[PDB]
Amino acid sequence: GSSGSSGRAPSVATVGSICDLNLKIPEINSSDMSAHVTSPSGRVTEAEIVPMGKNSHCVRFVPQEMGVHTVSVKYRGQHVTGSPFQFTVGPLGEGGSGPSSG
Hints:
This protein has 102 residues and is mostly beta strands. Helix content is 0%, strand content 30%.
């Protein structure tokens, strides 16, 4: 468990919307990396690592509403610095903006 709470903080991720994880670790290759989105219900899946550029990994995954998931990233059989990375999902957001054309 955590040591309490960090006051307040915005939504790092969005519900339904593709969640990309900005990771920059040149000490490792995307060909030897692994990611898995674990759900608070007991369901974990495999995330995809898209080539962003220089030692840049983009973990694309679809989170849930009001659900805190954990990103399990291991390397050569050893969790990477920081990982696992836990993040809380918030509201998708009230979208809808545009003039009256048609």
